[PDB]
Amino acid sequence: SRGEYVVAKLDDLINWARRSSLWPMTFGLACCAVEMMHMAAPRYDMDRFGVVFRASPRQSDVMIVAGTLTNKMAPALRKVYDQMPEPRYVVSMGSCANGGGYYHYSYSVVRGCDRIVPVDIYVPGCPPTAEALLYGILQLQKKIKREKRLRIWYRR
Amino acid sequence: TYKYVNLREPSMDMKSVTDRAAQTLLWTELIRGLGMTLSYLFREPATINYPFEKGPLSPRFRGEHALRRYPSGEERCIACKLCEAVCPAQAITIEAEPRADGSRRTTRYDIDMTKCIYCGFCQEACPVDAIVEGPNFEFSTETHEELLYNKEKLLNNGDKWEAEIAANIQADYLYR
Amino acid sequence: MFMINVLTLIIPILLAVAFLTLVERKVLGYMQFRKGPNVVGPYGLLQPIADAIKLFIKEPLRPATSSISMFILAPILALTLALTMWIPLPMPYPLINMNLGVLFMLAMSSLAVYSILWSGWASNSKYALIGALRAVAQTISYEVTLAIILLSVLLMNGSFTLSTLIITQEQVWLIFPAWPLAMMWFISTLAETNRAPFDLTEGESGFNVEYAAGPFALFFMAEYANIIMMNIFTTTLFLGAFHNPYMPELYTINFTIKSLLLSITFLWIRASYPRFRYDQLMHLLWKNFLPLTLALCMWHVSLPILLSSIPPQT
Amino acid sequence: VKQDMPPVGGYGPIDYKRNLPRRGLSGYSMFAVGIGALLFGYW
Amino acid sequence: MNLMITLLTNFTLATLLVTIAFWLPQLNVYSEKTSPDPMGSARLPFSMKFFLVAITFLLFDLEIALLLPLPWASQTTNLNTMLTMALLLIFLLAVSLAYEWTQKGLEWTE
Ligand SMILES: CCCCCCCCCCCCCCCCCC(=O)OC[C@H](COP(=O)([O-])OCC[N+](C)(C)C)OC(=O)CCCCCCCCCCCCCCCCC
Ligand SMILES: CCCCCCCCCCCCCCCCCC(=O)OC[C@H](COP(=O)(O)OCCN)OC(=O)CCCCCCCCCCCCCCCCC
Ligand SMILES: CCCCCCCCCCCCCCCCCC(=O)OC[C@H](COP(=O)(O)OCCN)OC(=O)CCCCCCCCCCCCCCCCC
Ligand SMILES: CCCCCCCCCCCCCCCCCC(=O)OC[C@H](COP(=O)(O)OCCN)OC(=O)CCCCCCCCCCCCCCCCC
Ligand SMILES: CCCCCCCCCCC1=C(C)C(=O)C(OC)=C(OC)C1=O
Ligand code: SF4
Ligand code: SF4
Ligand code: SF4
């Protein structure tokens, strides 16, 4: 049909523009911040993918939770998540953000940031390398590329 | 055995005073900084073309975990639980029993990859080179429980990456 | 036919502002030993298009505004003033050839602080209001040296006519008799557009953080239109090119190359310095640029009289 | 034995001091060039 | 007349882009957000120094307004009087700046 073709091409356009202009807000909590900074450093250079370095939280498209989430900061994480405009994504970077990690059995650590915010990409490592984080960001772009917002809207 | 950073008295003759005033009014060090930034403008950047170009790794690299085999297909793990005793984050969960040929083998070999600190104490505690931490670092998932590897997943990582893992161990086993 | 001329002014303004963002990311890339965008388009040429489409379908941030009306008026005023600063620019012929184009530009740039002030008050954040007051005080401070430097230069021109400023510089660039005015002018235009090292709206909240991605993109493109415009105006004012009246495109190519190099010099200054503290650029204005500017204004009043070099009125 | 060692004569010398290489004209010379540019412009 | 057409075109294009930027993403049905600043609820403390720099701007802007007809005033035939009054106005702006200096008016925003 014509309408299905039109909403498919518009889905492809808006998914292209969203995955090719991802703006991150990095929670530089712990040691994974150093490796996000290496993913911004000139060897890997996220800025050539259209992924800018340190966009403000009220204009960013993806929240990279890079470090250990403690109990004292989990409401601040959730408040910054609630202040992000949609579509917002969450990359969980490294073991403490993924599942608690080396501080999993601690009294003061949230056992993974997925107890606090919905998470799209889990990037494993302690820390994951800057290349592994850039792999996770390209996998997030591939996840955005196969979104079907207007096709489901046309089929609802 | 020590030195004084910033203990210089500037010269007060008219030559040096006029040098400092030409610096103040004519912005000479600011042009120096613009020159250094212009100098990096015309350099070749250090940017590799990921994913087509890859960061250089060593054979010691500690990435994704894999249970290995012998050159007969028999799995190397003889269920001794040294890796989960040494495991600093308690990521390794092991249950064992004698199987049908009476061999000491595991029935559970789980590694929570979201507890794992990727320090490789398991592969150096292992007496038979069964668990290793292989060279894969590109294994990001979309779901948390996809990073909760059981024995089937780890044996499949061994079968997947063994051609590379064996050569890395061949490079580094004389340092171990 | 005149409406076609207005559209061929203001649509290329928006396209040049669109690709200035790409040029900034690329040049700041290579000066930082990395690359800029080269994935999204070939050589990154589709990065501004992708970013515009991303920002215009992002969720509206939906603030509680103290005033809805001034929250609407501040982007409208910013874009209207940033588009009307271009119409007297002689390149080689202005769209609107007016007798007082210099004073017109000084007036319409003096009106640009109301967008900052109205957007700061139209937000409910008090800290955004404090940042807006600091940005307005910075801008109105450097407007003083804008006006006095600009007067001291136009003492060699003879009029406020922008097209006469090409005739003034036919034998020599006007940067040769007025390079101290040129360098204080250039840093004052750097401080007008809130450009680094004078960008305290990103130094640790901006005045326009409560706007959605669309309206903040409109503020952003009005700012870059002001940047390109002030570089063109500085080019016309100190680096005035050769103009053959039978071949106007020679002047258009020449001022275009010079204005591009001056905009890249803005890009190259933000890749080189740390920020000022707020009192330090206040110290830069009131205690350094303004005494020299008054002294050189006395000098450029008395100098055409003592050398018999008073320019003509017409 | 085969071990990661320096070579027989050791490695070469390594620079570790400050080198800001002192470029530019004198202050007298820079004010002379600036005043001469002003005089050419005024003429 | 061409100026009024150009102002109307610039204002209309600005209003059109502002209308698009405020109403093109309103067509989406994203989600309703509950959403329950460095200062919490403390009233804005007044700064005397921002007011003083704005008033100093206003007074120097009036002195600039006096200075603005100099490229026309240089064409006169009473040039000694014109030069004397031009130097006197710029000197009185300098004396205003010097008095603003010496009574510590340019301090903490120097
Ligand atoms: C238009 C095209 C470009 C124009 C040139 C500009 C290109 C270079 C730009 C470089 C990047 C600059 C980034 C921002 C820099 C901001 C900092 C800065 O420079 O502050 C200004 C600095 C401030 O200095 P400061 O603050 O570091 O100095 C200390 C001051 N106290 C002691 C008060 C704390 O200098 C000036 O204010 C000078 C402005 C220009 C002066 C020009 C003088 C010309 C010569 C006059 C005659 C002299 C001889 C005497 C009379 C002789 C008569 C015969
Ligand atoms: C004053 C001058 C101003 C100039 C401004 C513009 C500057 C940049 C110009 C463009 C640069 C090159 C653009 C190339 C776009 C990408 C084309 C492409 O390869 O798209 C591939 C994509 C999918 O293709 P597919 O067939 O699926 O591939 C499988 C093949 N086995 O297929 C698609 O995505 C579908 C096709 C999309 C084509 C888009 C083309 C670019 C749009 C540019 C708009 C502006 C054009 C110039 C305007 C001014 C001059 C008139
Ligand atoms: C009736 C039918 C039409 C219905 C309405 C649709 C109108 C036209 C919309 C544009 C064309 C539709 C297709 C959109 C792209 C779909 C194909 C695609 O995504 O191809 C991917 C390809 C790059 O591949 P990628 O996945 O990025 O791989 C990374 C590299 N390893 O991507 C590329 O090669 C580049 C893709 C560029 C997309 C087109 C160019 C941008 C849009 C231009 C027009 C709109 C904006 C105009 C200007 C706005 C203001 C600046
Ligand atoms: C919040 C409200 C909305 C805010 C956004 C929109 C408004 C702000 C941005 C636009 C500002 C409008 C400026 C209009 C006047 C500018 C000054 C001017 O006209 O100068 C040009 C010229 C003077 O030069 P000259 O060559 O001597 O005169 C022609 C003689 N041959 O003189 C001429 O060419 C004269 C031409 C005829 C007279 C033109 C009259 C214009 C209409 C009245 C003012 C409109 C603006 C009112 C609102 C201001 C801002 C609130
Ligand atoms: C009428 C609309 C024309 C297109 C919009 C302006 C051109 C694209 C600019 C994109 C952009 C870039 C690159 C950008 O980096 C940025 O962040 C500082 C923005 O502000 C939110 C931007 O708007
Ligand atoms: S996953 Fe590891 S390296 Fe990363 S922040 Fe946690 S403790 Fe530090
Ligand atoms: S690498 Fe370290 S933390 Fe991970 S399973 Fe092995 S011993 Fe445990
Ligand atoms: S992997 Fe090695 S250390 Fe762990 S139980 Fe098996 S044989 Fe023992």
Side-chain angles (χ1 to χ4, degrees):
Chain A
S1 66
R2 185 179 178 179
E4 182 68 29
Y5 180 78
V6 169
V7 302
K9 298 287 103 176
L10 287 175
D11 271 328
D12 289 334
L13 181 63
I14 65 170
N15 289 326
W16 176 74
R18 285 177 177 174
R19 74 177 180 268
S20 60
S21 176
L22 282 174
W23 289 355
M25 185 269 170
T26 300
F27 269 95
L29 305 179
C31 335
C32 268
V34 175
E35 203 78 32
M36 175 267 165
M37 289 160 71
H38 277 282
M39 201 266 278
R43 176 172 292 177
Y44 294 104
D45 177 52
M46 62 176 74
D47 193 75
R48 64 101 175 264
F49 294 99
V51 178
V52 302
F53 177 60
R54 292 183 181 180
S56 69
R58 295 178 73 185
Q59 73 183 0
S60 64
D61 308 339
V62 51
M63 184 177 72
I64 298 167
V65 181
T68 308
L69 185 68
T70 60
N71 287 326
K72 195 171 183 178
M73 199 174 170
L77 179 74
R78 183 70 192 184
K79 183 179 179 181
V80 173
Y81 178 73
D82 292 331
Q83 289 171 355
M84 288 181 69
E86 289 186 355
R88 71 265 185 96
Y89 301 95
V90 172
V91 171
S92 176
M93 182 185 177
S95 291
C96 300
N98 284 324
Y102 197 34
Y103 308 96
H104 179 82
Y105 293 106
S106 175
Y107 59 92
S108 68
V109 176
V110 183
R111 291 170 184 88
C113 70
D114 59 354
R115 291 173 183 263
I116 304 298
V117 292
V119 180
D120 284 314
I121 305 301
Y122 291 85
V123 181
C126 181
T129 64
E131 199 173 3
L133 180 65
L134 185 57
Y135 181 78
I137 296 299
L138 294 178
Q139 186 175 1
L140 180 65
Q141 291 181 358
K142 294 178 179 67
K143 184 174 179 178
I144 296 169
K145 183 171 183 177
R146 62 181 184 268
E147 289 187 356
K148 297 179 176 66
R149 295 178 185 269
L150 292 172
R151 285 187 288 268
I152 287 166
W153 176 75
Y154 184 78
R155 288 191 295 269
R156 72 170 65 247
Chain B
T1 189
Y2 74 101
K3 66 173 76 176
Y4 289 106
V5 297
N6 197 4
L7 193 64
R8 294 288 182 89
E9 181 66 31
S11 296
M12 293 302 294
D13 54 349
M14 192 67 201
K15 177 71 170 64
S16 299
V17 172
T18 309
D19 290 332
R20 292 194 296 273
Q23 184 180 3
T24 302
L25 291 175
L26 297 173
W27 303 348
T28 297
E29 84 279 19
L30 302 177
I31 307 301
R32 292 282 294 273
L34 287 178
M36 191 64 72
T37 305
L38 185 67
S39 74
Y40 282 47
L41 175 64
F42 291 99
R43 302 186 195 185
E44 181 179 2
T47 304
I48 65 170
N49 193 6
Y50 189 77
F52 290 19
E53 294 167 351
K54 298 291 184 67
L57 294 176
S58 70
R60 297 189 184 182
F61 176 71
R62 303 202 298 266
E64 191 177 6
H65 293 278
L67 287 170
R68 292 183 67 242
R69 294 181 185 271
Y70 288 110
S72 64
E74 178 62 37
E75 60 190 3
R76 285 174 174 267
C77 180
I78 35 84
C80 73
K81 301 180 178 69
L82 262 62
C83 57
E84 73 172 358
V86 80
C87 182
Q90 288 188 357
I92 302 165
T93 308
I94 298 168
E95 296 185 357
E97 80 188 3
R99 64 180 184 185
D101 59 356
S103 181
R104 181 182 169 102
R105 299 295 165 186
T106 58
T107 60
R108 181 186 294 275
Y109 197 88
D110 298 336
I111 294 171
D112 192 354
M113 300 296 285
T114 70
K115 293 184 188 179
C116 178
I117 75 170
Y118 297 90
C119 73
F121 290 182
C122 51
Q123 68 177 353
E124 71 191 10
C126 186
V128 293
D129 295 332
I131 189 64
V132 294
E133 193 169 1
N136 192 6
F137 60 96
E138 290 166 346
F139 63 109
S140 301
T141 62
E142 296 181 357
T143 312
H144 188 186
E145 59 265 16
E146 302 179 3
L147 291 174
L148 271 66
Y149 291 178
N150 58 10
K151 187 181 176 183
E152 302 293 329
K153 175 73 174 180
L154 290 167
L155 285 173
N156 284 320
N157 285 321
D159 293 331
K160 181 179 178 182
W161 295 96
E162 178 64 29
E164 182 168 6
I165 293 168
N168 288 318
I169 294 170
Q170 183 64 248
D172 199 70
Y173 76 104
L174 292 174
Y175 297 100
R176 295 177 178 177
Chain C
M1 186 58 69
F2 179 72
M3 185 63 73
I4 297 169
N5 200 359
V6 178
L7 267 66
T8 58
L9 179 65
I10 64 176
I11 292 171
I13 290 166
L14 305 182
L15 287 172
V17 169
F19 287 91
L20 172 61
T21 60
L22 173 61
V23 175
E24 182 178 6
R25 293 180 69 183
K26 292 291 286 183
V27 168
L28 267 63
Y30 283 94
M31 287 178 177
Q32 290 168 357
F33 190 51
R34 57 184 181 82
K35 291 178 182 290
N38 59 356
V39 170
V40 172
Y43 309 102
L45 268 297
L46 273 302
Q47 183 70 47
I49 293 96
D51 202 353
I53 299 171
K54 192 274 300 291
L55 291 172
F56 287 159
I57 64 176
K58 177 61 69 176
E59 184 186 4
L61 190 59
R62 191 177 172 87
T65 60
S66 299
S67 180
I68 300 98
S69 64
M70 291 180 182
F71 190 79
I72 299 299
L73 281 173
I76 298 171
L77 183 65
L79 287 172
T80 302
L81 291 174
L83 290 172
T84 56
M85 289 294 286
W86 289 77
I87 63 176
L89 287 176
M91 50 187 176
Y93 305 106
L95 179 64
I96 303 297
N97 192 358
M98 56 179 75
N99 198 5
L100 303 183
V102 170
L103 188 63
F104 173 76
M105 290 179 71
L106 188 62
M108 297 300 109
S109 65
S110 68
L111 291 172
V113 299
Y114 291 106
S115 64
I116 301 167
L117 182 66
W118 292 347
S119 70
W121 184 71
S123 66
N124 281 323
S125 179
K126 298 295 188 292
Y127 188 71
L129 185 60
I130 295 169
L133 294 170
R134 290 172 65 192
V136 168
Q138 171 177 358
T139 303
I140 66 176
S141 293
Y142 278 82
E143 285 173 0
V144 171
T145 51
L146 257 68
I148 301 170
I149 286 164
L150 185 58
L151 197 153
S152 305
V153 174
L154 267 67
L155 288 163
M156 288 182 283
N157 195 11
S159 65
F160 292 93
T161 298
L162 277 166
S163 297
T164 303
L165 190 60
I166 298 170
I167 303 168
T168 302
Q169 313 189 18
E170 288 188 355
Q171 297 296 321
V172 74
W173 285 345
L174 203 56
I175 195 167
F176 287 93
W179 61 267
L181 296 181
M183 62 196 289
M184 291 188 290
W185 171 260
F186 185 75
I187 302 305
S188 297
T189 62
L190 189 66
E192 282 290 321
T193 59
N194 291 318
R195 189 69 179 170
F198 299 100
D199 50 352
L200 294 173
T201 62
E202 64 95 21
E204 293 292 328
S205 177
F207 57 90
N208 50 5
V209 296
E210 294 290 327
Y211 285 88
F216 184 76
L218 293 178
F219 280 110
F220 186 79
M221 70 187 299
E223 181 180 2
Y224 281 4
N226 287 320
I227 284 172
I228 301 166
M229 176 271 304
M230 294 300 283
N231 291 314
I232 290 173
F233 182 60
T234 303
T235 292
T236 305
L237 211 154
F238 294 110
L239 299 175
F242 178 73
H243 171 68
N244 191 3
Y246 291 98
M247 300 179 77
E249 292 85 5
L250 272 68
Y251 187 85
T252 313
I253 293 169
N254 199 353
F255 100 101
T256 300
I257 293 170
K258 290 176 181 176
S259 297
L260 285 175
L261 289 176
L262 206 59
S263 180
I264 292 166
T265 303
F266 276 184
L267 307 182
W268 168 39
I269 286 168
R270 78 169 290 171
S272 298
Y273 302 114
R275 290 184 293 270
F276 283 100
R277 197 171 64 237
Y278 179 69
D279 61 339
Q280 291 176 354
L281 69 143
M282 291 291 105
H283 178 82
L284 181 62
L285 186 86
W286 295 98
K287 299 191 178 180
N288 299 111
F289 281 180
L290 185 56
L292 285 167
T293 302
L294 293 175
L296 289 172
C297 190
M298 278 181 278
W299 178 248
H300 290 88
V301 170
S302 69
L303 177 67
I305 295 170
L306 66 91
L307 289 182
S308 176
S309 66
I310 298 165
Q313 174 179 353
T314 65
Chain D
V1 297
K2 184 67 179 293
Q3 200 175 14
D4 195 5
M5 292 298 290
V8 177
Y11 295 100
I14 292 174
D15 292 332
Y16 65 94
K17 295 184 178 70
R18 289 176 66 184
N19 193 1
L20 301 180
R22 192 257 180 191
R23 58 182 296 166
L25 291 174
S26 176
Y28 292 153
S29 298
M30 286 187 285
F31 285 120
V33 172
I35 290 167
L38 288 176
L39 290 175
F40 175 73
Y42 296 164
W43 181 70
Chain E
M1 186 63 202
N2 295 117
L3 179 61
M4 291 185 284
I5 294 168
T6 309
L7 293 171
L8 184 62
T9 305
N10 292 321
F11 179 77
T12 303
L13 187 65
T15 305
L16 182 62
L17 289 172
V18 167
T19 299
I20 291 169
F22 277 106
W23 292 95
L24 177 64
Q26 292 293 326
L27 296 176
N28 288 321
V29 206
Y30 284 107
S31 291
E32 287 83 6
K33 265 64 186 298
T34 66
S35 297
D37 51 355
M39 69 292 286
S41 296
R43 185 259 179 86
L44 180 62
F46 186 79
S47 179
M48 198 68 210
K49 177 166 78 269
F50 288 156
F51 178 73
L52 260 293
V53 69
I55 293 296
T56 305
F57 165 68
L58 177 56
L59 295 173
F60 287 183
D61 188 71
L62 293 174
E63 292 168 347
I64 286 165
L66 288 179
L67 290 178
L68 282 168
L70 290 175
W72 287 336
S74 296
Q75 300 295 323
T76 190
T77 320
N78 194 2
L79 279 177
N80 290 318
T81 303
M82 175 265 168
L83 181 61
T84 304
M85 304 319 290
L87 296 177
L88 187 62
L89 280 182
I90 305 165
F91 177 71
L92 286 173
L93 207 163
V95 169
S96 297
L97 182 63
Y99 183 78
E100 189 76 29
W101 192 293
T102 57
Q103 300 296 317
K104 300 296 182 182
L106 302 172
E107 292 299 325
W108 291 351
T109 60
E110 286 86 7

